[PDB]
Amino acid sequence: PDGHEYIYVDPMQLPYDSRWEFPRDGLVLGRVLGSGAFGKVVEGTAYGLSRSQPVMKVAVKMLKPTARSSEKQALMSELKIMTHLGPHLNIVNLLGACTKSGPIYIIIEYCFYGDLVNYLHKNRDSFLGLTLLDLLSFTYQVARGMEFLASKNCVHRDLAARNVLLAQGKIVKICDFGLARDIMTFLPVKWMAPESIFDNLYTTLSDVWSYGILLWEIFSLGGTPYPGMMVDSTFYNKIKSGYRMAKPDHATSEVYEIMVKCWNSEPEKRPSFYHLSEIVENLLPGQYKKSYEKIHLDF
Ligand SMILES: CCN[C@@](C)(c1ccc(F)cc1)c1cnc(N2CCN(c3ncnn4cc(-c5cnn(C)c5)cc34)CC2)nc1
């Protein structure tokens, strides 16, 4: 800090804009989309949330009655981050919330095709329909969305294929900001950088490590990272020594080269999400680049 005049703007301290508030009785709760020990996401129908769509399908993140304060305070914090983030094409964007007079409801875009893990398991036989160019489009859009998070000093801390969703028009959207921290329990260690596991250090650079693991998931068509390996003292010794995963079945040399850079042991030698977007842009048609900025512009 150059002087006392220059303050860090903490999103937790910022007031809640009531333009996000949506009446609880304009919301119909439908089938479960995801579930946990003390929380769940359900499908919903929102009446009067959008002028363009007076009756529009959405998804609703909510806690179970089993939840007990610790998860309740965090769900409120997850809402503060999403309100201060602003919108982006490749983020499941916040639509509204039910914060008054009862449990917290977070209302987000519904994504037609679901998570990338199950989406690729379905389309395995289609692969050799779903092409390799599709996987590169998924790879590129995640890099743009993480570039957006990093530009807002937002560390996702749980980037993976399960938290990447596919919406209408094959538009990739990153979801689940429950672990998201503004820079300065049970953990997804197989997606975590060594300095995260060992030194509790989470940066945008440790997201890049997780981006590498996500890349492996995509080009293994939904495979389990480090398959057959239990996470134990020997696993931590291999990760720390320098063990990496072998190239998956369908990735090219250029694509495996990206994972290798993402898994560099020195966090500062890993590439930026800006440079990662530039690299993947080469590996795609030029029609794609103009086709993306037109979608990004209209949004
Ligand atoms: C820490 C995380 N733990 C929790 C358990 C959590 C929850 C609430 C809490 F209060 C606390 C914790 C969690 C679990 N699961 C999600 N997911 C799932 C749902 N997913 C979707 N979002 C929007 N649309 N959408 C469409 C589909 C779909 C699927 N099949 N088909 C054809 C379509 C799936 C989605 C986004 C998020 N999130 C959170």
Which one, of 7, 25, 171, 182, lies nearest residue 100 by Cα? 25
Residue linked to tokens 């998804």: 59
From the CA of 200, how far away is ligand 1's center (Å)? Answer: 26
Q: Which CATH number applies to 11-109: 3.40.50.720, 3.40.50.300, 3.30.200.20, 3.30.360.10?
A: 3.30.200.20
**Cα distance between residue 148 and residue 180, in whole Å:** 13
Question: Which of 31, 33, 40, 43 has most ligand 1 atoms within 8 Å of its beta carbon, as the pocket-test mutant?
Answer: 33
Q: Please give the distance, rounded to the nearest whole angstrom, from the Cα atom of residue 259 to the centre of ligand 1.
A: 27
Q: Is 129 annotated as a binding residue?
A: no
Q: In angstroms, rounded to a whole number, what is the distance separating the alpha carbons of residues 243 and 237?
A: 9
Say whether 158 is catalytic: yes
**What phi and psi, each to the nearest 5 degrees, are found at residue 24?**
-65, -25
Q: Is 59 in the pocket of ligand 1 (CB under 6 A)?
A: yes
Instruction: Quote the ligand 1 centre to 194 CA distance (angstroms).
Output: 27
Q: SS3 for 130-176, per residue?
A: CCHHHHHHHHHHHHHHHHHHHHCCEECCCCCCCCEEEECCCEEEECC
C-beta 158 within 6 A of ligand 1: no
Question: Taking CA 72 as the corner, what is the angle to CA 149 and CA 160, rounded to the nearest 5 degrees?
Answer: 35
Of the candidates 17, 115, 158, 232, the residue annotated as catalytic is 158
Report the separation in Å between the CA atom of 121 and the middle of ligand 1, taken as the mean of its atom positions: 18
Q: For residue 113, give Cα distances in angstroms to 36, 116, 123, 172, 256.
A: 21, 8, 12, 10, 26
50: tokens are: 């959008």
Domain ranges within the chain, ordered by starting residue: 11-109, 114-288
Question: To one decimal place, what's the resolution in Å?
Answer: 2.6
- Cβ of residue 175 lying under 6 Å from some atom of ligand 1: yes
At the fourth CATH level, the homologous superfamily of domain 114-288 is Transferase(Phosphotransferase) domain 1 (1.10.510.10)
Ligand 1 atom 16, closest CA:
34
Was 61 annotated as part of a binding site? yes
DSSP 166-209: EETTTEEEE---SS-EE------GGGS-HHHHHH----HHHHHH
